[PDB]
Amino acid sequence: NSLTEYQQLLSAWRMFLIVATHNADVMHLTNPEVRQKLFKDILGGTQALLVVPRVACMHLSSMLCTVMIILLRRWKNDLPEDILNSLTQILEGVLQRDQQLVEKTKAQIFSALISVLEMKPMKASEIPQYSQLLLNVCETLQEEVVSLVDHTRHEVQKDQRDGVCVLGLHLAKELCEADEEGDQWQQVLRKLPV
Amino acid sequence: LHLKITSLGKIYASTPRYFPLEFLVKYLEQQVCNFSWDAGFVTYTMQEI
């Protein structure tokens, strides 16, 4: 019953932090400690909100996602394992979701994970559930790719499908670049006629 | 049981979210403990998949 109130207040905190990061000096938003606190809090908030199985949580997490994306882009130089595990569980929930509403969330979580890996070059051994991570990446890639295939074939919404496609492509490219031996990649390609 | 587990793993071993490898291994080890079977069970069945 307090829904609309918390929603508007979150819109307020959002717009506030946005106008802040755009002019951090005027806001005195130079503190990288505060920058990291904000980033982590908004991330975890998107997480907990996107964890509830049973429409409001969707829109809320989507706003939080747009925010976290712009924020990470601006504060990258101020911006990991626990973040990896968290974005993993988050993408997991985003997978157990109905597709027609989870697309933007998948794209966001993907760019987030990409930033998490680009933040520090890591080998597959330091990536928790790296097997499961690549597994899910492959599942999503397969599904969305077949989808975009059918969509392009029926064309005998143009740019977004290709955008997500190229996105997952570069994602898997980096994931494989993390696995030089391909043994896990081998088990994967053996499991999937990608 | 080795037959059944070999079968089911042979189907779902490609998707780690429905093939709880570690839980299955611990459970099969506990069951072999319970029934005093050949300690080579778990390795044989799981490698068969």
mmCIF file of all heavy atoms in Angstrom, chain B residues 10-28, unseen atoms left out:
data_model
loop_
_atom_site.group_PDB
_atom_site.id
_atom_site.type_symbol
_atom_site.label_atom_id
_atom_site.label_comp_id
_atom_site.label_asym_id
_atom_site.label_seq_id
_atom_site.Cartn_x
_atom_site.Cartn_y
_atom_site.Cartn_z
ATOM 1 N N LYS B 10 22.689 -38.805 -18.422
ATOM 2 C CA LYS B 10 22.957 -38.780 -19.855
ATOM 3 C C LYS B 10 22.042 -37.808 -20.579
ATOM 4 O O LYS B 10 22.364 -37.357 -21.683
ATOM 5 C CB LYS B 10 22.799 -40.183 -20.431
ATOM 6 N N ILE B 11 20.901 -37.475 -19.973
ATOM 7 C CA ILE B 11 19.968 -36.530 -20.575
ATOM 8 C C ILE B 11 20.267 -35.109 -20.114
ATOM 9 O O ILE B 11 20.354 -34.184 -20.930
ATOM 10 C CB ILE B 11 18.518 -36.930 -20.245
ATOM 11 N N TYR B 12 20.428 -34.912 -18.806
ATOM 12 C CA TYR B 12 20.523 -33.562 -18.265
ATOM 13 C C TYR B 12 21.940 -33.119 -17.911
ATOM 14 O O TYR B 12 22.104 -32.010 -17.391
ATOM 15 C CB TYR B 12 19.628 -33.433 -17.026
ATOM 16 N N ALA B 13 22.967 -33.936 -18.168
ATOM 17 C CA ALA B 13 24.323 -33.526 -17.805
ATOM 18 C C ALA B 13 24.823 -32.354 -18.634
ATOM 19 O O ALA B 13 25.900 -31.822 -18.342
ATOM 20 C CB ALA B 13 25.317 -34.679 -17.947
ATOM 21 N N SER B 14 24.091 -31.948 -19.670
ATOM 22 C CA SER B 14 24.524 -30.819 -20.483
ATOM 23 C C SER B 14 24.074 -29.478 -19.921
ATOM 24 O O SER B 14 24.624 -28.445 -20.317
ATOM 25 C CB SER B 14 24.016 -30.975 -21.920
ATOM 26 N N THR B 15 23.106 -29.464 -19.002
ATOM 27 C CA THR B 15 22.565 -28.239 -18.416
ATOM 28 C C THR B 15 22.787 -28.294 -16.908
ATOM 29 O O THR B 15 22.057 -28.992 -16.188
ATOM 30 C CB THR B 15 21.083 -28.067 -18.749
ATOM 31 N N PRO B 16 23.786 -27.574 -16.393
ATOM 32 C CA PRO B 16 24.139 -27.720 -14.968
ATOM 33 C C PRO B 16 23.032 -27.340 -13.998
ATOM 34 O O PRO B 16 23.183 -27.585 -12.795
ATOM 35 C CB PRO B 16 25.353 -26.796 -14.811
ATOM 36 N N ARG B 17 21.930 -26.753 -14.468
ATOM 37 C CA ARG B 17 20.893 -26.295 -13.551
ATOM 38 C C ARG B 17 19.885 -27.382 -13.212
ATOM 39 O O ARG B 17 19.100 -27.205 -12.274
ATOM 40 C CB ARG B 17 20.163 -25.090 -14.140
ATOM 41 N N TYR B 18 19.872 -28.486 -13.955
ATOM 42 C CA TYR B 18 19.026 -29.624 -13.632
ATOM 43 C C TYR B 18 19.817 -30.898 -13.384
ATOM 44 O O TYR B 18 19.213 -31.969 -13.263
ATOM 45 C CB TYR B 18 18.001 -29.868 -14.748
ATOM 46 N N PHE B 19 21.143 -30.811 -13.309
ATOM 47 C CA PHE B 19 22.015 -31.947 -13.018
ATOM 48 C C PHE B 19 22.914 -31.547 -11.859
ATOM 49 O O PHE B 19 24.082 -31.187 -12.066
ATOM 50 C CB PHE B 19 22.838 -32.344 -14.241
ATOM 51 N N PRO B 20 22.418 -31.595 -10.625
ATOM 52 C CA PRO B 20 23.228 -31.143 -9.472
ATOM 53 C C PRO B 20 24.376 -32.105 -9.173
ATOM 54 O O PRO B 20 24.313 -32.971 -8.302
ATOM 55 C CB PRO B 20 22.201 -31.091 -8.339
ATOM 56 N N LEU B 21 25.456 -31.936 -9.940
ATOM 57 C CA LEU B 21 26.576 -32.872 -9.916
ATOM 58 C C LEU B 21 27.084 -33.117 -8.504
ATOM 59 O O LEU B 21 27.221 -34.266 -8.077
ATOM 60 C CB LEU B 21 27.707 -32.354 -10.803
ATOM 61 N N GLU B 22 27.379 -32.049 -7.765
ATOM 62 C CA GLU B 22 27.954 -32.218 -6.434
ATOM 63 C C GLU B 22 26.973 -32.892 -5.485
ATOM 64 O O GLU B 22 27.350 -33.796 -4.729
ATOM 65 C CB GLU B 22 28.394 -30.867 -5.875
ATOM 66 N N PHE B 23 25.716 -32.453 -5.493
ATOM 67 C CA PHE B 23 24.718 -33.076 -4.636
ATOM 68 C C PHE B 23 24.533 -34.540 -5.002
ATOM 69 O O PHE B 23 24.436 -35.404 -4.125
ATOM 70 C CB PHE B 23 23.394 -32.323 -4.738
ATOM 71 N N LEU B 24 24.475 -34.834 -6.299
ATOM 72 C CA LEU B 24 24.341 -36.218 -6.738
ATOM 73 C C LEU B 24 25.518 -37.055 -6.259
ATOM 74 O O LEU B 24 25.342 -38.185 -5.797
ATOM 75 C CB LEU B 24 24.221 -36.273 -8.259
ATOM 76 N N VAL B 25 26.730 -36.516 -6.373
ATOM 77 C CA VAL B 25 27.921 -37.263 -5.981
ATOM 78 C C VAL B 25 27.902 -37.544 -4.489
ATOM 79 O O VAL B 25 28.174 -38.665 -4.046
ATOM 80 C CB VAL B 25 29.194 -36.502 -6.391
ATOM 81 N N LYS B 26 27.581 -36.528 -3.689
ATOM 82 C CA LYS B 26 27.519 -36.727 -2.246
ATOM 83 C C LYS B 26 26.431 -37.730 -1.876
ATOM 84 O O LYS B 26 26.623 -38.575 -0.995
ATOM 85 C CB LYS B 26 27.284 -35.389 -1.550
ATOM 86 N N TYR B 27 25.285 -37.664 -2.556
ATOM 87 C CA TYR B 27 24.188 -38.576 -2.249
ATOM 88 C C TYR B 27 24.537 -40.007 -2.625
ATOM 89 O O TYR B 27 24.216 -40.944 -1.888
ATOM 90 C CB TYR B 27 22.921 -38.129 -2.976
ATOM 91 N N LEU B 28 25.194 -40.196 -3.769
ATOM 92 C CA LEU B 28 25.596 -41.535 -4.174
ATOM 93 C C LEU B 28 26.676 -42.080 -3.254
ATOM 94 O O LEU B 28 26.692 -43.276 -2.948
ATOM 95 C CB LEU B 28 26.076 -41.519 -5.624
#
